[PDB]
Paper text:
Human [name] ([name]) is a 37-residue polypeptide hormone that is co-secreted with insulin from pancreatic β cells and plays an essential role in glycemic regulation. [name] forms amyloid deposits in the pancreas of >90% of individuals with T2D.43–45 A single genetic mutation resulting in a serine to glycine substitution at residue 20 ([name]-[name]) is associated with familial, early-onset T2D.46,47 Recently, cryo-EM structures of [name] amyloid fibrils assembled in vitro for the wild-type (WT)48–50 sequence and [name]-S20G48 have been determined, as well as those of patient-seeded WT [name]. Here, we used cryo-EM to determine structures of amyloid fibrils at different times during in vitro fibrillation of a disease-related variant of human [name] ([name]-[name]). Strikingly, the fibrils formed in the lag, growth, and plateau phases have different structures, with new forms appearing and others disappearing as fibrillation proceeds.
The fibrils present after 6 weeks, which represents the growth phase of fibril formation, are strikingly different to those observed at the 3-week time point. More surprisingly, and in marked contrast to the single structure solvable to high resolution at 3 weeks, six distinct fibril polymorphs could be identified at this time point. However, four fibril structures could be solved to high resolution (3.1–3.4 Å). Interestingly, the [name]-[name] variant generated two major fibril polymorphs, which are each structurally different to WT [name] fibrils, with different subunit folds and fibril crossover lengths (~45 nm for [name]-[name] and ~25 nm for WT)48.
Author numbering:
A (entry chain G), B (entry chain E), C (entry chain C), D (entry chain A), E (entry chain I), F (entry chain B), ...: 13 to 37
The structure:
Amino acid sequence: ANFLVHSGNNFGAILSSTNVGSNTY
Amino acid sequence: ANFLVHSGNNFGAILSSTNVGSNTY
Amino acid sequence: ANFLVHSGNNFGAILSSTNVGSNTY
Amino acid sequence: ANFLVHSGNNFGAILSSTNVGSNTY
Amino acid sequence: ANFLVHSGNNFGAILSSTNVGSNTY
Amino acid sequence: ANFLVHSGNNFGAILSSTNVGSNTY
Amino acid sequence: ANFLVHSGNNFGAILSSTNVGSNTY
Amino acid sequence: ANFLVHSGNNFGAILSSTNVGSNTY
Amino acid sequence: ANFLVHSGNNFGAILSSTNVGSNTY
Amino acid sequence: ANFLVHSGNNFGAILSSTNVGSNTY
């Protein structure tokens, strides 16, 4: 089993970016 | 089994970006 | 079994972006 | 079995974007 | 079993970046 | 005499803002 | 005499801001 | 006489800011 | 006479800032 | 007479700053 948890992350500004704040499997 | 959890993430502004705040499998 | 959960995510503004705040399988 | 859950996501403004806030299979 | 936990991370500004604030498997 | 000229300005997305792209006197 | 000229300015995304791209007198 | 000229400025993303890309007198 | 000229300035991302890319008099 | 010229300046990311890339008089 694989568990991925993402919580309470604040991102100000994202430009021309990939795989940011994501659960990539 | 694979578990992906995404919660409570604040994103200010996103421009020309890919796979942001997503559960990609 | 695969479980993907998406909850309580606030997105300010999205421009010319792909796969944002999505459950991609 | 595949389970995809999408809830309580607030999107401010979306322009020229693809696959945003969607359950893509 | 693999457990990945992401919480309470503040990101000011992200430009032309990859795999930032993400659980990559 | 006061001259104010506003031309050819492209605005992507505006949220909770005041006095944007305006000639304020 | 006061001359203010505003032309050809591209703004991606504006959030919770004041006096942006404006001729304020 | 006072001359203020604003041209060809590209702004990616603006958050919680004041007097950005403006001719303030 | 006072001449202020602003041209061809690229700004990536601006957060919680004042008097950025402006002709302040 | 006072002449101020601003051209071709690239700014990556600005946070909590004052009087950046501006013609202040």
